[PDB]
Design a binder for these strands. Structure first.
Lengths: 532, 530
DNA sequence: AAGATTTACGGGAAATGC
DNA sequence: TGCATTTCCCGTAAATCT
């Protein structure tokens, strides 16, 4: 899955390693010569024509020494610029892309979430810098021993040290990331939504892969760390994290030795204009401090915005808010997003809509079948704008409920009662009556369709059969649906004066598609209302 | 609902009031005469600076009459103390103790004569009488400070009189502090003395000494497992704490009748984490305490609940309830937590009463002896004196089945509440009958005569009926199944064909019809024969 | 008042103790 | 191990806030 630019980054990183290596060798040469210069110098003073040519050699050794410092110092600076320039591609371009991909993952997109490459690049670069700094320290030690007027260690060394410290210090900061966003174990498909009292899990990783830090750092987690008007908005609820809020970062489980810290069993408790709870947003923040080779570096990171709810019947509106947010911004910390919520093109929405099915189950929605829903948002499809109100905030067109609330419930019906049946391709599910009409027009009596109810909150399932004159039945509710499967009821259906339907549109007979999902001493009992 | 003995107690209490009244009057007479004696005495001393002769005779005679009146009073005070002493024990050890038993029978579903109004009246009447008697004894003391002589019966008797009356009042105060409502979860009103951890329960105490000066004076502290973990107590049981607000002020509020009480709501139980008995039989006590300071005295009051079983999931309740049934059916001991190490043996009489109550208080009618007797055979096999053991009843399964007699029964009770209360206790269900005696329907009656019967082949419950050709019946519809259609609806709902008469002679739709009952197509289902 | 939001708690399920 | 007991947490209902 590699890209043009990624191949250059990896190339520039091996380059940086090469230069640190080349420079190391130069330091050994300069240091030996400086040893040699001292030993001869000391010998001459000890002495107190043959003698005269030794002074000429001392003289010449020194010239070469100064030449070698200049060379080194100059090449150190070149390396710093290159590291400086390559770091910004690492941190502001490749890392920042992985962060977006996290947002798209959470809501059900293509999960290229792997940090293995990034961690490798970053640790490669970190390794390179810490050695560069040990080289600068070396130069310093050398000037303490041997200096003169004009000495380029005296003149450049502090800048070199300053640049490298600042580099390492920011790379360390970028490397502390949230590997798994807060999520309830119980609702794996709806992260960034936390109900009070129920447990959620979150994980951080330091991508600077240093073994000497194993078990060294404690991470503290918390929520609303900078609230009470620290940035903005005075109105909102405030929570605390209960359970065990600090945890030690280690390499444990041996995934690949990565430094991480995983928080389990955390709960949220409420501390007791604006926005409805469903659109209100909070941040979970992680912190720590590293002390490494002379430096103290504070690390900090935070989660994506989370919505906190208190009953689970609030989740379907809460999830929409997560969908909408992560669909349309790349900003990690915009809690006031829902005061002025962005407006989303039909393209954006439709992708995301499919993902909801395509990650609770195996296939998404077919463009034609999804496009049925497209008419429902507007009226008789690429540049069309969808507004938060059209989507979730207000009800749709005289029904008592939301477009998304209604949709989500179907997405639940598939999971609870008909998952297999759903993506066998068996369900068309979404179709307008005008275009529903073109089955019996084209096909023989007993050709049927599987369709979802629009006249209902939560969900109902429906079907097309003939006597023609197209007919259909009162959608069986879930409370009803517990007892018999929809496939069982389809194949169980008849109109005791009985009989039913024959072909799942287009040409397939009934029992081949739907028979696989089909099923003194008193009297065994199983039933169907079928018709009156 | 008054009794012979109760009428005498009330009579003896009006008597005690009469004597305190009669004595009060005697104290006024003695005190006036003593005023008079002083004033004359003082006048004679004033004189020291025939007439003066006969005044000394009157002083002399006033004094004699004074001493006479003290003796009389002191003697009658003592008589009263004995009578109060004797009447208190009937109040406290006989009438109060009976109300306490009746509480136990109430909790498990018996006749609820639980009213404390009478008791509180008697006790407050007596308390009022004693505190006045003591103010009379104090008065006698004041009088001896003023006027005494050799032989004076206040000097000689007064301390005993004071000692007896203090001890009396002090114990009557202690008996009067009681638990009016036993701990119970609001959500399970019919199963008190069973508390699940985390869920709220409510309990109430009352001081039956009806004194208005104590309104808002006393703080009651509640708690659980106080003085447990080894002051005679069994080792290795669980220990809990009460969360929420564990003290509360006693007042006369709501004006029920002005009674002093303190009600605890919203309390929860939490295990104090960090083998003798299973949790369901393990017992704890909730204790209430306070201290009263009243007219010179400090009195500690204490009381406690009946034994409670603490559970943690609600699926534990039906064995927990049995334990409450068994305990309160068979002991009158308020604090026996080791009861279930050696549990008593219960006669079929005792059990059958209690069994009916469970239906008779979740719903309107109990069990008919005939229908109840079907269950009786199930405990033993082909009943007045027959003994039932805790193991037969609840601890072990009934032979062959994988579950308890009581667990199975309780579930049926639940079934009557959740799906068929009306249909139940209309007479409409016989419900419990042996096949041998089930057989005597179509033997006597015409084809389509049916019965309503409960399943034995099932944990939780099932409901069943008679269908004839071949006597027949169907796979009992489970409660899950039963959510969708009522049993009456399904009976009357039943190429199809069903039944005609609820045994004995009643047709179908008169008894069971009252509980019965483009644009797509409205549909409802009936399994029927198939 | 009605609408929003949170609390309460059964019941099945899973985890933990023993 | 299997069995006992407790925790977990949805989902409806009721309570509370606004």
């Amino acid at each position: 899955v590699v890209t043009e630019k990624q191949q250059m980054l990896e190339q520039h990183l091996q380059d940086v390693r090469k230069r640190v290596q080349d420079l190391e060798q130069k330091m050994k040469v300069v240091e030996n010569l400086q040893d040699d210069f001292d030993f001869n110098y000391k010998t001459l003073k000890s002495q107190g024509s043959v003698t005269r040519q030794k002074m000429q050699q001392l003289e010449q050794m020194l010239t070469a020494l100064d030449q070698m410092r200049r060379s080194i110092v100059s090449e150190l600076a070149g390396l710093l610029s290159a590291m400086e320039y390559v770091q910004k591609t690492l941190t502001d371009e490749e890392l920042a892309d992985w962060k977006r991909r996290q947002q798209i993952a959470c809501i059900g997109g293509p999960p290229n979430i792997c940090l293995d490459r990034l961690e490798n690049w970053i640790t490669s670069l970190a390794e390179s810098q810490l050695q560069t700094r040990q080289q600068i320290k070396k130069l310093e030690e050398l000037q303490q021993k041997v200096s003169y007027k004009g000495d380029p260690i005296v003149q450049h060394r502090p800048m070199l040290e300053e640049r490298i410290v600042e580099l390492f210090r920011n790379l360390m900061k970028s490397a502390f990331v949230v590997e798994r966003q807060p999520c309830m174990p119980m609702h794996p498909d709806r992260p960034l939504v936390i109900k009070t009292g129920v447990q959620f899990t979150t994980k951080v990783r330091l991508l600077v892969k240093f073994p000497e830090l194993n078990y060294q750092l404690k991470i503290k987690v918390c929520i609303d760390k900078d609230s009470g008007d620290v940035a903005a908005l005075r109105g909102s609820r405030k929570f605390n994290i209960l359970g065990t809020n600090t945890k030690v970062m280690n390499m444990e489980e041996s995934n690949n030795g990565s430094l991480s810290a995983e928080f389990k069993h955390l709960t949220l408790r409420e501390q007791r204009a604006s926005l409805i709870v469903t659109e209100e947003l909070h941040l979970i923040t992680f912190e720590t401090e590293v002390y490494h080779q002379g430096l103290k570096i504070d690390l900090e990171t935070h989660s994506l915005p989370v919505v906190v709810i208190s009953n689970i019947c609030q989740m379907p509106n809460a999830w929409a808010s997560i969908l909408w947010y992560n669909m349309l911004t790349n900003n990690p910390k915009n809690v006031n997003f829902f005061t002025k919520p962005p407006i989303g093109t039909w393209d954006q929405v439709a992708e995301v809509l499919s993902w909801q099915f395509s990650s609770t189950t195996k296939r998404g929605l077919s463009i034609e079948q999804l496009t049925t829903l497209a008419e429902k948002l507007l009226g008789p499809y690429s540049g069309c704008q969808i507004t938060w109100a059209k989507f979730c905030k207000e009800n749709m067109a005289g029904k008592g409920f939301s477009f998304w609330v209604w949709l989500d419930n179907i997405i639940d019906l598939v999971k609870k009662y008909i998952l297999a049946l759903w993506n066998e391709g068996y369900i068309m599910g979404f179709i307008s009556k005008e275009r529903e009409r073109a089955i019996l027009s084209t096909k023989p009596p007993g050709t049927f369709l599987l369709r979802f109810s629009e006249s209902s909150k939560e969900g109902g399932v429906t079907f097309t059969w003939v006597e023609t004159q197209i007919q259909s039945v009162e959608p069986y509710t879930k409370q009803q649906l517990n007892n018999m499967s929809f496939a069982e009821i389809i194949m169980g259906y008849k109109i005791i004066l009985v009989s039913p339907l024959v072909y799942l549109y287009p040409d397939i007979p009934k029992e081949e598609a739907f028979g696989k999902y089909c099923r003194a001493p008193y009297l065994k009992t199983k039933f169907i209302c079928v018709t009156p």
